[PDB]
């Protein structure tokens, strides 16, 4: 719905993707390079973000299949309050921007750090 | 002026009549559906799978020419006329058995029970051996061609990317 209910999760949610775009390095895209070693890519050889289907399906419905009821658990298995959190909604928005809107991994100095 | 009020289910508002939906299917003989949906492609459960095999025909493929009769545009488009009139009278009056006769408006018994009902493991025998087969003609659903004008599923094939590259 909800409302109000859909912030905490949004909180945790973007947090990891935001977490992607900071603790990274990175390494592709590419673009600009070359876009698409380990084995090569080992990465299957080409086009495989459809495990996401299953996977990004497998967490959100698997979250909510919850709901405490949770069923989804199941039988067995052995085959100002928008003011606060919602300003917090902004300052997390934001530092996607500067953590993206220039390169971070600068690594421009200053000195050197490894090297 | 019934009822209506009631009318209905008899009121309203606001809920569970429930019978319920609407918004999908379906009350009366939503079993004509049932009884049509099994057969129709249990039928098909034997057209493409023979096909999905033949590519692999170990040593010799098949062969059969005729040995029947050979002349001026001879044989098989004539045709369904005979072939699927025969299996025409087949379809029809087996499955006027949603009930069925006129409930809508010699002897008696056989068999013993209620469509020799069931049994109560054989109800399960029919189960998703009936349904899972129409889970698997969902493979059909998704073309049922695999020849997607696809070249392609040749040189036979079919599949088989896994997925090589280079």
């Amino acid at each position: 719905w909800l409302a109000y209910g859909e912030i905490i999760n949004g909180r945790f949610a973007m947090l990891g993707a935001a977490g992607a775009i900071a603790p990274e390095i990175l390494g592709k895209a590419g673009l600009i390079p070359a876009e698409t070693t380990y084995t090569y890519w080992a990465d299957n050889y080409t086009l495989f973000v459809l495990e996401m289907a299953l996977m990004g399906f497998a967490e959100h419905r698997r979250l909510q299949d919850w709901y405490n009821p949770g069923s989804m658990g199941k039988q067995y298995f052995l085959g100002k309050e928008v003011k606060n959190g919602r300003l917090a909604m902004l300052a997390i928005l934001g530092y996607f921007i500067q953590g993206l809107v220039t390169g971070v991994g600068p690594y421009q100095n200053l000195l050197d750090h490894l090297a | 002026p019934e009822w209506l009020d009631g009318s209905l289910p008899g009121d309203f508002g606001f809920d569970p009549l429930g019978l319920s939906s609407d918004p999908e299917s379906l009350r009366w003989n939503v079993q004509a559906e049932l009884v049509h949906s099994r057969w129709a492609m249990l039928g098909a459960a034997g057209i493409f799978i023979p096909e999905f095999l033949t590519k692999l025909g170990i040593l010799n493929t098949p062969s059969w020419y005729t040995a029947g009769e050979q002349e001026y545009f001879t044989d098989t488009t004539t045709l369904f006329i005979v072939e699927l009139v025969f299996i025409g009278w087949a379809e029809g009056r087996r499955w006027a058995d949603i009930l069925n006769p006129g409930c809508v408006n010699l002897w008696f018994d056989p068999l013993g029970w209620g469509s020799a009902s069931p049994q109560k493991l054989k109800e399960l025998r029919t189960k998703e051996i009936k349904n899972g087969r129409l889970a698997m003609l969902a493979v059909m659903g998704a073309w049922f061609q695999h020849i997607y004008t696809g070249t392609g599923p040749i040189d036979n094939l079919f599949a088989h990317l896994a997925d090589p590259g280079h």
């Binding site: - | 003989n29 004509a32 949603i98 006129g102 809508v104 408006n105």
Partner: protein, 42 residues
């Protein structure tokens, strides 16, 4: 299903619907025997 029956109807677009999804056929036939001009019996 039944029985004649009756059976069940629906609302305002049935006399209408009849125009389209079936009645068209006409233009197939009228294509099939391009125009008519007059009587082709068989």
């Amino acid at each position: 299903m039944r029985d004649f029956k009756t059976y069940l109807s629906v609302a305002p677009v049935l006399s209408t619907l009849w125009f389209g999804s079936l009645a068209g056929l006409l233009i197939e036939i009228n294509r099939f025997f391009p125009d008519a001009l007059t009587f082709p019996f068989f």
